[PDB]
Design a protein around this ligand. Sequence first.
Ligand code: HEM
Length: 414
Amino acid sequence: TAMRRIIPADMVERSRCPFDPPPGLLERRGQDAVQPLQLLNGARAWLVTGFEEARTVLSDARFSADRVRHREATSLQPHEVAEFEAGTLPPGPAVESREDGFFVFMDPPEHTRIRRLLTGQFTVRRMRALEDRVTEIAVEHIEAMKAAGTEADLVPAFALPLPSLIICELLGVDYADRAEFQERTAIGLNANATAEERAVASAELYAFMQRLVADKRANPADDLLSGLVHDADPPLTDAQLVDVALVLLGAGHETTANMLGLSAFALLENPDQLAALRADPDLIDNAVEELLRYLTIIQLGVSRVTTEPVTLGGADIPAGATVVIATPEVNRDPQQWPDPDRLDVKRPRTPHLAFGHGVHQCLGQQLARIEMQVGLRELITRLPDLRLTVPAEQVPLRDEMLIFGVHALPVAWS
Ligand code: HEM
């Protein structure tokens, strides 16, 4: 169930055009907003390209996020497709039976009970604290790049480490454990790492999270994970806390890192937009929202399953169907954004779907916005005459993974 064994290539392959929609998404423009999608495993799903239709999927009681109970077409092993199509593939476990912390695969009220504990740690006071910590880590990384020379690969020097170290801050990873943590999270994202090298790094992090939760139970500090372990009422089990720590790491690192690298890339390819930002630093917050709309690193990973038949976007979707949001095309819906394929950091700011919608809308979105606002402000103000040192078409793209991004971003400054 690797993404490229499931999603048709033309819906995700950018070739050497990172900012342009893949041709299979382009070819659905001006058609019904919801259309069938034939998956490479032979299973059927439905694809949503409409903004209003995507909002409905993500905030309608007939579309379930419980992808444990409701099997998705995108999850099917080859031996399971004919059972799925025949309606004889069993559901996963009923949520009443589950003891795990994977609240991402739950609907209200089971979702709500765990999501409330996490919102409870993402307080406005913690967010103010994290903005200061983001500022420190960003400036330290940029000052390190400038001390080492006049050129850098922005991905390992800046885009990967800042969000990884912010996860370390949330989880209360001790200073002496950070280098190893950073190494293991980087392996996950390395083009050159084998499936065996990855599965070892993944097992090392799972065991690390178990040890980290046990350590916060014994020796709590001021971090979000200490808060979940000690201050949560009602209390989570150790197993649930491990699951929540793995969810935060999974959700908060790769996305933010890829957004930092691709945002720097887009600004260097759109010097007029970079000029607007250097000229008026107050534009940074609106610019981050435009970059989130324009780049949409989530790709086709946002899906739900119908629990009853639904008519939407010109489609009669049956019960039990997988509905995939084409988040990059939803964020280019010309009903919402005139001239949607233009990067315009001065655009009037209106809601996009880069962080999803409804009860599961990104828990980390304020923190992600802080990382982008601070990161890009510090990069643009500290690195004069920042430039790519390879042509844009030679920057290597990550379009075989669930999250889109660049593998390298070679830059220089003066
Ligand atoms: C630019 C960076 C990011 C993007 C684009 C992003 C995008 C998303 C999206 C689209 C979802 C909704 C998925 C769905 O409904 O199926 C989501 C959920 C979530 N994200 Fe973010 N994310 C980012 C950063 C972060 C960060 C920094 C954290 C935490 C530190 C975080 C934690 C979460 C969590 C825990 C969920 C699950 C929420 C739930 O199911 O209730 N994310 N993210």
